[model samples]
Target: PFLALSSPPRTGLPVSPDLSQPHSVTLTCSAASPYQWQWRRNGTLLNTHTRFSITPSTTHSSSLVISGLRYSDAGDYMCTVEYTPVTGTIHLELPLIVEVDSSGLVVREGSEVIVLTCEVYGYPRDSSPPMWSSPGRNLESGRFNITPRYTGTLSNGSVSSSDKVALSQLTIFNITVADEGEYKCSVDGESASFRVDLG
Candidate 1:
């Protein structure tokens, strides 16, 4: 019963409306004989990431401050002060939201060649995969042709910042009118997609 009694929700957390305006909020934990203070979010342990942080003001008084709040940052939050008297965790909630947008793109199609291109926001790591598509040139119909045949994870639509990704003329070698339509490209773990079209 002592363990159960000790683990009741600790206190001292507040909610604020000015998350984006750069304001600060204070969170506290009840101190027992020898206690350690911690913070958590949505049942998961909180850290430097996710925008939630504990500032150094005092031992018992922990300040929770969120900087540059975004739509993805909205979630539930809680504080835990572990020790003899109050070994339990306290839970409070903060629901923050923001808006974002995707980049633009364009592709061109022709009598014998079709080229596709796309651009997106964010840094690219070398481990990222390439984006691939159906090659709007129409290889099966023999209307347009492709040269220097290539295939790979990075080529499949995963454009990296280190290198500008491009289909660079799936050269048809010969021109044809039937080669016209849409092409598809996909990059893994990305929010947006690449598009292809006939000129």
Candidate 2:
């Protein structure tokens, strides 16, 4: 009924893509009935092209993939779904985005300290302080606390200003075997993960 039309697929927070490597951004939408799907970028309709692919996994689920990501790809993306039922026609809109940063790192178990860096490109850079996370503890867990050693901006010659980019480093002191695992750096809900393969 009306509920089905109003209840759109849950589109999570915008993702941050790593600039150092090629990557793909995928967005999905779901509906109970067979829904026609369309993808749009910043209000303009997008179609299957050299770097974009749309896949319909099932009658209910549709996926949009954007490959060969660049800073230009960072923007508002939307997915629209439509289905015609006996009652009426239902429509739903889901919005998504992309942004990210990182570097590979390894530290020895006995190392005195370890540092992980995260550079983020998205909205409200001032509020999006870098945070540390892991499988066991997160930024609010108090198990570990991190502060930025340095902060800066990124220049990509994009339309957005430099302040859109944020950079910070997280430092861990007195590393031990117990610290070996995966560590993640997050900014404004977007994050990148790296392994801590201690020797």
Candidate 3:
């Protein structure tokens, strides 16, 4: 019933474009047969860039393309039609990737220790810390440690200043069967879950 904005599909949809790779995204909008278009991200208007391709709002279509998209490329993109008062919005998402730190980790029945990590992305610096949920045992047992870090960078990936990271590491020492279960880490309602299992 309003200006149509494309890309990102929906809000809170997790998208992790590799920071080391070259990537691009085109945000297209449409409404009536002829109209005007203005683009902004997280409230700031976008300007001309050599790597960007901005098209005019004609034939009921307009597009803003961004090349060399970095981790900073994630945010809320707003499209304003010169019909003008009303605006169309979409959230360009990123984040919520969780995994066990060690690759091909083989957890023995009595493993010495295990570390589970969850990387929550989006927002800017000073974002809230991540919260964790254990399987069942009392996490205050001192055998379990949950640490939150705001290092803009992740062990498996990296992000730019435009994007901030709230990473949590769950370190369980003297891993026991009690620690073998599901673990969830969340940030601002969105969350990632991991399974802790021992062989």
Candidate 4:
């Protein structure tokens, strides 16, 4: 073999980096200096660009940085290390998605409770559940109640497994004039905002 990999990069598994936030992956190798490495996405070689960066540390490790992450960035990423006589490679795969129920909401004054739900789809799952935020007011101000619920099944009668999903429901009870403004729901870096209009 030309090289030996000590460990795989973090991107090899389902990583839930904050949506649209910077993410980094480091791959370690057993060999020291005088080694050349390459990074690829979905089998395509990567280059240092405005959105992507690569750095080598010591003679044993290499790191990759994505300045900002987006939904399209989810794919199979690999790191390969090569020396004079041998080569080694490692891979990391990730898939993620976040969405909201509505883009714009119209609520009448004194209406019943209004519900905003956020749906999540990804791997490794979110370490924390989803929550609601408002630009007009604080969520803890006693005007709204947040309810989180999850439903998934492992058996979908297919070669692939199911039961890897999450949902968050935010309910604002007794909508008054006070709750009119921009409301957002975010799961790490995945977020959506909607404007509430009082009619």
User: How does residue 193 of candidate 4 score in lDDT?
Assistant: 70
TM-score (C-alpha) between model 4 and the true structure: 0.43
lDDT of 4 by residue, 1-199 (tens): 3455655533334644433322433434445334677777777888647767787876467777764343445566566776543334444344445556642343547456677777654432344456688875888766677777765531221111132244677667777777788788777556767666677
Give the top-scoring candidate (TM-score). 3
User: How much is 196 displaced in model 2, in angstroms?
Assistant: 22
Q: Each candidate: RMSD to true structure?
A: 11.6, 11.1, 7.1, 12.5
Best by lDDT: 3
Q: What value of lDDT does candidate 3 attain over all alpha carbons?
A: 0.59
Clashes of each: 15, 2, 0, 9
Model 2 agreement with the true structure over 51-110: per-residue lDDT tens digits = 878888644666777765444566666666665431111122211122333333434475
Q: Model 4: residues >4 Å from true position, as ranges?
A: 1-95, 102-111, 122-124, 151-166
Query: Model 3: how far is 78 from its true place, Å?
Result: 7.6
TM-score of 1: 0.31
Instruction: Return the clash pairs for model 2, or none.
Output: 16-99, 17-99
At residue 149, give the lDDT of candidate 2. Answer: 45
**lDDT for position 59 in model 4:** 49
Q: Which ten residues in a row have the lowest lDDT in candidate 2?
A: 86-95
* Tens digits of per-residue lDDT for model 3, 1-199: 4545443344554445443232556777666433666778788888566656778753466687777554456777777776424466666655433333422343557567777766543332233456778666676778888777656433233344344343667788776677777777765456667777667
- Candidate models: Cα lDDT each: 0.39, 0.52, 0.59, 0.57
Candidate 4's displacement at residue 107, Å, is 11
Judge candidate 1 against the unseen true structure and give its global Cα lDDT, from 0 to 1.
Answer: 0.39
